[PDB]
Amino acid sequence: VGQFWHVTDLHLDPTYHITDDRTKVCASSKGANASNPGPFGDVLCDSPYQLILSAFDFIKNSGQEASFMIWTGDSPPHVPVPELSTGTVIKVITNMTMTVQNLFPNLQVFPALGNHDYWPQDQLPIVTSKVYSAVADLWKPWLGEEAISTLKKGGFYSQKVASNPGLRIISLNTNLYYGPNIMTLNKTDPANQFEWLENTLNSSLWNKEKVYIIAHVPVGYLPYATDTPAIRQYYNEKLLDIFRRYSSVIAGQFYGHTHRDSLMVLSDKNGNPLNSVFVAPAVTPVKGVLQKETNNPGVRLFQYKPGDYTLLDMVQYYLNLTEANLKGESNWTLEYVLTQAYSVADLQPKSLYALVQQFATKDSKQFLKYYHYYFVSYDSSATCDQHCKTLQVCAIMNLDSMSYDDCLKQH
Ligand SMILES: *[C@@H]1O[C@H](CO)[C@@H](O[C@@H]2O[C@H](CO)[C@@H](O)[C@H](O)[C@H]2NC(C)=O)[C@H](O)[C@H]1NC(C)=O
Ligand SMILES: *[C@@H]1O[C@H](CO)[C@@H](O)[C@H](O)[C@H]1NC(C)=O
Ligand SMILES: *[C@@H]1O[C@H](CO)[C@@H](O)[C@H](O)[C@H]1NC(C)=O
Ligand SMILES: *[C@@H]1O[C@H](CO)[C@@H](O)[C@H](O)[C@H]1NC(C)=O
Ligand SMILES: [Zn+2]
Ligand SMILES: [Zn+2]
């Protein structure tokens, strides 16, 4: 089989350091006491360099063959806008990029921008910018002239996969659609990314290519909230229309941003499953003071059919953070293999559609496991009551506003 890695939401905090006063352990805790801080982080902190390095070192030494890597954004830490600048955002993205290029000199990597990959965060523009030009320079080892040109103009590109003839990655800037982006209010096609996307998918159709979509913020609804799409509804609906129309050319969709392990299945209006969607959890374990749950750090690997690119499996790895901070050594380890955790043949939409139908049945053992894996096994005693379960299952199965509302009405 072929394989590729997916990492996301690294969120390096360069200030992390163990010290007696736990309000000074990390600037990303914003003056709150780090809860139980160790060398690999704290649930109230973003990622120490040591954690990010241990993730990439695990990947390097895993014994897993992989022909490329996708990397879907958010490298600066969660600190207030005035504590960052354009220069600091670039410096952190540069550090992450150079860590990857130093450790994996021969591995093509396909990055996407996250909402924090800009100063101020979330305000990614629809014209060229310092950050777009800087990441064009940084990612030039992996990208050709046309990809570099679109990246500098609007933060998006497509690129052939050198090691996989007939495969093309489309890296969208979905931060252009993200609610907090005040640079794009009421634009029908910001940075002309929809037109471009349609043009690109058309060319892949006629060049007999398969396409993997990557982006930071995903399509669909947030599974912990009621009727809250991850990007603005207008843009979610327009993007999903493109994806449905081209669902025979797109062989997978891969997102980050939510810092959780989630599945979605894009269907049409009449319940026919069309395309599979995978949201990967973060390397950072950070959470706010009030939140009950967070994720363990995660990285994941996809297996696909050579020369075909049908998705065959997904292996999710994780770092048990409490364990690693208690002994001072990481033990990145397999959390689950999707086919064998869920007893499904593969990652095709039919397989995942049937699995979600299983999730919806009462006391489903599969949904209980899924919900535990949602937080990357942070809390094995975590409960999802009927309202919580309806929100998760409806967001998994229904990406568009109409079918999602239908789903909630019936549940
Ligand atoms: C991650 O590691 C921690 C630490 O070993 C595990 O938590 C321990 O679980 C045992 C068994 O229930 C408890 O008796 C200990 O009190 C726990 N230790 C701490 C420090 O909380 C945890 O179960 C591991 N996570 C997973 C998913 O296995
Ligand atoms: C942090 O913890 C110390 C030790 O308990 C305490 O004295 C201090 O007030 C705490 N500060 C905050 C902001 O919680
Ligand atoms: C990234 O930052 C860490 C600490 O902030 C430093 O130790 C490391 O050398 C940096 N890496 C690069 C490639 O600049
Ligand atoms: C799609 O691609 C073909 C082949 O390159 C081209 O002839 C055609 O004009 C394109 N159609 C659109 C709508 O862009
Ligand atoms: Zn993030
Ligand atoms: Zn984000």
From Swiss-Prot:
Requires micromolar levels of Zn(2+) for activity. Inhibited by millimolar levels of Zn(2+). The keyword Signal applies. N-glycosylated. Gene3D superfamilies: 3.60.21.10. One of its GO terms (molecular function) is zinc ion binding. Transmembrane segments: none annotated. The keyword Disulfide bond applies. Its EC number is 3.1.4.-, 3.6.1.15. Its cofactor is Zn(2+). It is found in: Secreted. Disulfide bonds join C26-C45, C384-C388, C394-C407. It catalyses: 2',3'-cGAMP + H2O = 5'-pGpA(2'-5') + H(+); 5'-pGpA(2'-5') + H2O = 5'-GpA(2'-5') + phosphate; a ribonucleoside 5'-triphosphate + H2O = a ribonucleoside 5'-diphosphate + phosphate + H(+); ATP + H2O = ADP + phosphate + H(+). ATP binds at H78, N115, H116, Y224. Its main location: secreted. Binds 2 Zn(2+) per subunit. Changing H116Q: Nearly abolishes enzyme activity. One of its GO terms (cellular component) is extracellular space. Detected in blood serum (at protein level). PANTHER family: ACID SPHINGOMYELINASE-LIKE PHOSPHODIESTERASE 3A, SPHINGOMYELIN PHOSPHODIESTERASE. Monomer. Homodimer; homodimerizes following 2',3'-cGAMP-binding. Cyclic-nucleotide phosphodiesterase that acts as a negative regulator of innate immunity by mediating degradation of 2',3'-cGAMP, thereby inhibiting the cGAS-STING signaling. Specifically linearizes 2',3'-cGAMP into 2'5'-bond pGpA and further hydrolyzes pGpA to produce GpA. Also has in vitro nucleotide phosphodiesterase activity with nucleoside triphosphates, such as ATP. Has in vitro activity with p-nitrophenyl-TMP. Has lower activity with nucleoside diphosphates, and no activity with nucleoside monophosphates. Has in vitro activity with CDP-choline, giving rise to CMP and phosphocholine. Belongs to the acid sphingomyelinase family. This is Cyclic GMP-AMP phosphodiesterase SMPDL3A.
